[PDB]
Every structure is written in C-alpha cells, then in structure tokens.
C-alpha cells in the first residue's frame, strides 16, 4: 500500500533524534552531531519560507522535515512541491483549522502528527499520518513532565488494549473516539502501527534516554550546542547504558 | 463474506411488516394477515422467551421466525441460535443485561436485528455485527412521534453525509463516535449499509405508510392490542405495500375499529 | 396561484362559527343552529384532556357519515406533521384539513408540507411569527389558539391580542427596521411585508380555545377575528347554546341582541 | 498457612451452584438437584427486599436441622461486622460463613476479622479493590454481587466485568505503575502483585445477584466466574429449575445442552 | 436593479481586493494586479475623507471601494454621491447602529456585507447586499477564524442542497433567514451572490487555501509586510493559480517578512 510505504519511510528514523533548526548553520551542526533528520522552522507562526527550506536541504544529506499549520493543506501542498522528506502537521505553530486536520492521504509525502493520548494518535493515523509525535509542553519550557504523562498514557492504553476481552473493544473504541479497525490493529501488534517519537521539554541526555526507556522510537529536540546535541544523540543510541549516560552528561554546560 | 450474506438474508424482508406474537394462534393470525415475519415473545424483568413457545411458533408458520435476546446477553442469543431461529433481536424493549457492551454479533451465524435512535448508534451496532437496523421510537405507547424523530434523525444525517466534503468526514465520524469505514461506506451507498425498519408507536395504517414514505424498508408492530387484530393486521400490511396510494390507505383504514 | 385559490375558498367562512362534532346527530344540530362548517373528530378537546391516550385522525367511516349528513363544509383533524393522515383525508373528499395541535403531535420538528395538497389547510398559532410560518408552509387559514378543553378564554385573548398587536406595530414600522423584526419573529420577510402592507393576516383568522358563552364569541370578533371555533356539546343544551353563539358572532357589535341570545341558555361547561 | 488451607477448601466448589434455603425440604431439593452446597437463612433476598425489617443470622435450630438433612457443605450468613454471629456459626459447626451484605449491616466501618476464625469465609464484592480488601481481612472465597432479590442480572454483569477487567489490565501493566494502581484501588500492594502474577483472583470467585435462568448462570461462567449463587424457590417449579441451573453451570459452553435444560422450565421469578 | 448589482459583482470573481490608505498604495496595488481597491485612512473608525477617496478614484482604473459604518446610511449616501463603484458596510469600522443594517436596496451602487454564517449571509443579501464577504479575525494575520466561517457557510450550503424539501421550513427558522433566499440557495447549490474571504489572509498560501475551500476571491488588509509590491503580486498570482502548488512555491519563495 502507499500508506505502508510511507510508514516504511519513517521507520528509518528509528533510534534517532530530530533537531529543530532555523538556518543552514544550525542544520549543519545538527548533522555533525548525528541527528537522523532536521525539522526546519523560521505572533502567528506559519510554514517557513521556502527559500530557507531549500538552503537547509542543500546544506545537509540527512532527511529534511518542515512544519505546516494544523489544517493548512495548501502549506502542505507547497512543502511537498519543494520536495521535503517529511511534513509535520504541527500544533506548535498556529492552528489554521480548529475543526479539521489535513487529509494526509491526498499527499505522497509522509506526515508526522502530534498526539497526547491513544485516541488522538489513532485519529491522526486514520487521516493518514505515517508517524506520531507524543507531545508534551508546546512552548520551550524545558520541562518533560507533560511528555512523560502523554507517553505513559499512550503506552498504558496500548497495554490495556492488548489484553482486553475482544467483546469489550467496541465500547473501548467509542470511549477514546478512535476508528475501530485501527484499535483492533493496535491490539494485534501490541503497538501503535506507526513510528512514535517523544517530544516536548527534552533538555538533557537523561530526559532523552528516559523517553526511550519508556518505549518510544526516538525523540524530537527543540551554551554549547554541538556538545549538547551530540550528548543527546549518544543518549538515544545508548539509552540503556548508565555509564555512557554519565559521560554524556558530564560538564555539558548550562542546559 | 459471512456478514454480507446475513445482510442479504435481511433484504428478503424489505417492504414487509414484522408482528409481535405470544402464542401460535397470534402467529397464524399474523401470517394469515400477510406478515413478512413474526417476533416471538411473552413491570418485571423481561427476558428471552421460553424455547418451548418459540418452537411451537416456528412450527405453526412458514415465514421467518425472530426472537428477542436481552441487550448484551450473548448466552441467550446462543440458545436462540441453537434452536434454529431465523433472526435474533437484541432488543432494548427487554431488560438490559449489560449496560456497557452489546453482544458481539459476528460470533454468530444467525443474522441480528438491533435498535437505534441515531446514525452513530446504528453504525456502532452494525460494526458489532448487526445485519438489520431497527430505528426505535417509543415502546408500548401507540405514539409514533419518537419513531418519526429517529427516522428523520438517521435519514437526515445520511443526507448530510452524502454531500459532505471528504476532508470533513473524519471529524464527522468522531462527532458521531462511529467507525470511519462504515461512515464512508454509508456516504457511498447514500443510505444505510443494511436493511432499516421503523418500530415504536405504529398503531394505524397511516402510521405505517408514513414510515415507508419517510424511507423505512418496513415496520415492526407490537395489533392484538386492538379491537379486531386480524383486520388491523392486514390493513397495516397493505399500508406498507401500497404506502404511496392514498385511495388504498383510505380503503384499509375504513371501519378498522378501536385502534 | 393554487394557493391564492385556497385562500379565497376560506373567505366564505368569515363571519362563521365552526363546531366540533363526534357523530351525525351533532353535525345536524350544528348545521341546524347555523354553523358555517363542522369539524369531525372522535373526541372533543375537553374529553381528550380529561381522558388522555393518543388522539389521532378520526376513522374515515365516521367522517364519511358526517359528510353525508350535512351540506355545509366538513373539516377533519390531522396530527401535526402526519402528512399521511392528511393524504387520507384529502382522498376521502373533505373540504378543509386542520393540522391540529389538540391531537397528539406526530412530528416534533416539522409541520406537514401543506402546499403538496390541493385541499386547503387550517393551522393553529399562538403569535404572529408562528402564524406566518404556518402560512409559508401552505396553511390557507389560521386559528390563533388559546387553551383547549378548559372553557377558559384567557389564553385565546392573550394570543389574539398578541397577533393583532404585532400586526399594528408592523404596519407603522420604519421600513428599514422590518428586516430585524422578521428575524426576531423568525418569519419569512416576504410574508411580513405582505402583512405590513395589508394591515392584517394575509389569510382568514379565527379564534379558538375556551369559547364557552356568546359573550366569549362576540369578544373574539370585537378583538378583530374573522370567526370562532367551538370544541357546545359539553354544556346543558347544545342546540340553544350553539344557536346563541352563532347569533353572537353575527351580531357581535350589538349588546341588546347579545343579552337576548344569552338569556336562559342553561348551564355552560 | 491456615489461610492457604481455607483457600484450598474452597477449591472444591469450583463448577458449583450454591443455593439459598429456608428449611429442610428445600435443602434436600437443592442437593437432589445437584447443588454443590446450601446457604441457610430464614428469608430469601427477594423476601428481605419486599418485606423489610432487620435481617440477622438465622436461628441455629434451623441451621442444625438443615446441616443434618444434607451431606453437601452447609453455609450460613452473618451480618457484616457481626463477629459474634460468626463465632456462633463457627461453634455450630458449619462449613462456610458468608459475611453477607444482603443481611442488615451491623458495622458500617469495619468488616469481621475473618483470620480470627478457623472456618472459611465468603465475602461479597463489587470491584477488584473491594475484593482484595475482603481477602486481606481473611476471606477465603469471593462473590461479586450484583443486585439482590430483583431477578435482574445486569449489576452482576457490571461487577464481574469490573473485577475481571481490572485483573486483565493489571496483568499487562508496567511494573513501575502497579504501586499507583494499588493506591487507586485502595488495596494492599502484596495482593495486587499476587493477582498480577496469577492472572486472576487468588481465591475462588463466584457470581451472585439476579441469576434467574440457566442462560444467566451460563453467562457468568463464560465471563470467567468459578460458579454461581442462587437466592429458584421464588419460581414456578424449584426442582426442575434448580436442576437446569446446575446443569447450565456444568455445561456452560454448550448451547445445545443449554437449550435442552431451558425448555419448558416453567415461570421464572 | 438588484440582479444588475449582483452581476456587477460577479465581475470581481477570481480577484484580490486590497486595502489602501492613499494614492501611492492604490497604484502599488493596481500595479500588482488587484481586481479592485478598498479606500480607507484605538479610537472610533469612520468613513474615509472623500478627498482621499477622490484622490484614489482618479489615480487608478480598477473599481474603487469604500467602507461605511454598519447602519450608517448617510455615510453611504455620501460615498455614493462621490461616485465609487462599491460600498462595503463593514464591521471593521465602528458599529453605528447595533440593531439595524443599512437598507441597501435604497442605493444604486452595489453593497458588500460581512458574515460569519449562512443565516447572516442570507439576511445581508435580503437587505440588498450584492456581494458577501465571510470575515474571520481582522488585523491579526491569523486565518483560523476565516477558515471556520468559510467552512461554516459552505458546509450548511451543502447540507441545504440535498436536504428533504419538507424540512427546509424549519431549517430557515433555525438560520433565522428568509425562506425564499434559502430555497433559492438550495436550488443554485451556492450563495446567490459573489462570496469572498477576508480576515488574516497574510501569505499566498492563505489566499490559495480560501480559493480551494470554494471562495470567489479574497480581501487583503500585504501592506503590513516587509515588501508590499512583491507580496501583493504573489497573493494575486496565488489566487489566479490556486491549484498550482509548483506555482505557489515560486510566489511564496523569498517574499520577505510577512
């Protein structure tokens, strides 16, 4: 399926960190530190200027993502035209449609969408999201609390579903306002049918490793960047190695 | 597919009238008046009827025999299926056995009828396996006002769905809290994916014809509560067959007696 | 238009008293007393209230009988929204159909589409917006209803004054403010302006509800109605009473006559 | 431990139907129909509800008689918290004591300390926390109760699904989250983990409340219970009915058999 | 005469109407390909000084619009006597009559009216509005509310299109709209007048989104940007090629700060 293909594309990002960058300079640093991809961003917050996105794409060889406003299917048409690798329909910038998200099945470019619980995730996937970011705080709070909450909520509901009496799954789907067939699939896989990255408030190597130990596939990250970024990449790569995590965190500078 | 077949079985009831019966006598009077199928049943807790009386009814008439099971009472269903009933009515007019879950109807070979009050609820019942939808108003009042409300509700939303922008159907599915697949499938067909009858309050020929004129594939009647049941039954049956023929509707409603 | 014609057909009722009847005898006593038309139903509103159950269209049989006993127009009630009860009445060959809110509402959200019929409709209302909405749906005749089966005329007076009150307000209203008035009324702008220009309801308007005595009927006429409904047989002597009410409507502006026809009428309801 | 032994003693009841009885005859009809045990009390729950008054432990006399009429285990109800009613039952030599919430609560804040007894206890529950608390107090057997003396099985279904639902949630739960789960349940952490590992209640679990027909009893078994209580004699023919329910529990996964034993059972309650 | 004003408006379909507060801009707007300009100039906001309106009506060759406070029929009389092409009874100006809009039928010139839903649109039209603009937020650069209102109107229109005729009476009541115009709208399958979008349209992508939603054009309040001329042309091109993503990329490419 074309969806299976998109879901297959995002799967190459597993085990990685995605870094938000605002220039060719930041993009280059992020690549050097081993970021699996960069997500381009430039009051109302909108899709970034295509010129900036082009410069970033040329400056690096890792996949390039860019944001579109929720429900702004034209911005998404534009991003797909200039040939980005992924589009993030991102609640971090200003929502353009309060009631409807982008009909992501109409695009060839794979989409990431945010979520705070299992029902949300599945709704985004039914709309055609190939990847999900389980999101905490929207601002740069450097606080991972809400992210942990929403990762545990998603992971926890999946575990409840896994073992659930089959007869009760219909009502369960209703309660979380999710498409039944996707709930059924998630039950079978004992996992959400797409790549799932933690995002929001990730500030330290310990934060990033925590997300991985909670079961995520990777993380998004928003006075020494090169070092900090390398530390987080290493953290995600060796999230089960406390000795490595220790080295990574040593004198990283002010977070 | 097994489900598609069950759906097909229920289509042989279109344009028909289903009548409640409590004895073999009534069942014959019902078949004699031209009922498409009969529904076997007998305050106080209301449960599935005794298989004894069900067997007697299935042995008196040659038309399809249906029977009620309490909502969520999957074992009652199993028992009805094992005695060779043609249809099972997981009906809310019986005493609810399970408050949060309905019977998983797919796990059965016999087709199910479920009730509903709106589109979302109809689609949820269908996703659970229901092969035939009963849009129910008020039970045991003889007042069709609620049935009209629900029929208009379901058919109203179906028409809204037909012409809706495809990018808005996802949100619509959420608002209905219904399975997206079935919502789109309903959008395509431009109608309910299964047979749809009306039930509740139908007390006169005019009531029955009104349901058909609204869009219902048929009606349930709960008759012998009238003055001359045999007469009233035939009138309603004719009403359903000739629902767009006033001259006829006048002819069968004339001197019907106490309704 | 076919609607202009139906509206015309109702003009013949102006100055009339329509009476509810439950059988022939009564229909005959109603015409014998000078009723402009009879309204056939298997239960009077007072009995509907005191009894309960579900009140539906009456059995055609009892309608055909009545329609063969009298020579004046014959009406029949169809539950609100029940367009099939209507179809049946139309087919039976009645003069007017009353989509009546004294019967058991059949559709809570939609009235019968009355245009789809060649036979004229009477609809109940309680205020001007409600009347103009019924008319837009096809109603050719309007009856402002008070309370039904109580013998108390107070609510009928409230509604009559309500409708006629706004009509007078509408007539002298600044043209630029009528749009807003239509919104507030929740009524079609076209009919509002047609009501403004005309200075009255663009259709026949009767009073109904609690009209028990001759004085009651005459009161409705002096308030500006075109006639009254009476739901007479729940009194001491129907004939004398029915005649008195008829006379009251014909002589509504004549107190001496009103005294005459009210004297020793018997026990009212 | 002496608690391990009591728990074992109850294992013999798995696959059984316990029946309420008010005299010998009944106890005999209960065993004659194949009941795994009888529960002696001077009033059935349906009569308790319909009558009122204060329902207490039954008179020993009527308990001794029953215990001498049958060979299957004999149970008796002790008011919640009434540890002296218990002592008396223990002394009388009954098999099990049901600290029953169908009798009149004697202590609103504290259940009987059941460990202080050598005789096994059955306690009622409505959810998982309530069951684990009863068990920690000593209860060797648990019955998830719906509503009593109504013949309606809906609340029993709610509770069964409630307890079994959380048990399944508990089994697959992240180990680090079980502490919080125990708090929310208000249940001892030890028993929660013992329930997690085991994948079920660490004691025998019966259904009770509104079980009227064979289909009802079989339903409880298919939901995952170990047996049912029946509070049979309030029906048409107790014997036939009691036998049918017993058979239903033994053949709960066999619709053909279920149809057989349900046919012409008479009038249910 | 009403059906004539409606026709005069259908000319503007596929166009971009731009706000302007002086001649220079009016030219910078026409030079970018606007299908018409809208003349204007905390604190009460009223009709613009005629002088400045004449300075703009004689500086360009495309239609010239002007705002008149809601209900201020004399501000409109003045705009008409000035000889401009369209009057916009606009809610961005300081409301003048909270209870009544201008009786627009009493004017020769075509009227634009704002709306947020289908009932509101139909009422303005019955008052004699020849053109309707569905307004979101004014002066925020955020199009979220415009999207809401556009989907609201187009949504109910689609609902109305396929609705059972018997149920339309009640639908008109709920909308608080004239039945005649409702049935009309049901027959046409769209607004019986030209329908533009306005409010928070800042970028080319925004403008194209409105067209894809099903609008006949857009208003822009472009000048709040770092390079007007470039931005204006891009938005104009966006509306004209609102289906060409490859084109939309070019016109959005390096357009400066929005």
Q: Could you explain the architecture of this structure?
A:
This is part of a larger assembly, with 1 copy of chain A (255 residues) and 4 copies of chain B. Chain A is 44% helix and 15% strand. Chain A is of the alpha/beta class. Chain A has an 8-stranded parallel barrel, surrounded by 8 helices. Chain B has one domain: Alpha-Beta Barrel (TIM Barrel). It is classed as plant protein.
Q: What helical percentage do the residues of chain A reach?
A: 40-55%
Q: Judging from the principal axes of the Cα atoms, what is the shape of chain A?
A: globular
Q: Can you count the beta strands of chain B? A: 8
Q: What is the CATH H-level superfamily of chain A?
A: Aldolase class I
Overall SS class of chain B: alpha/beta
Characterize the overall form of chain B. globular
CATH topology of chain A: TIM Barrel
Count of extended strands of chain A: 8
**First CA to last CA of chain B: what distance?**
44 Å
Name the helicity range of chain B. Answer: 40-55%
Number of helical runs of chain B? Answer: 11
What profile does the largest beta sheet of chain B have?
Answer: 8 strands, parallel, barrel
Termini separation of chain A (Å)?
43 Å
Oligomer: part of a larger assembly
Strand order in space, largest sheet of chain B: 1-2-3-4-5-6-7-8
CATH superfamily of chain B: Aldolase class I
- How many domains of chain B? The number is 1
The strands making up the biggest β-sheet of chain A line up spatially as 1-2-3-4-5-6-7-8
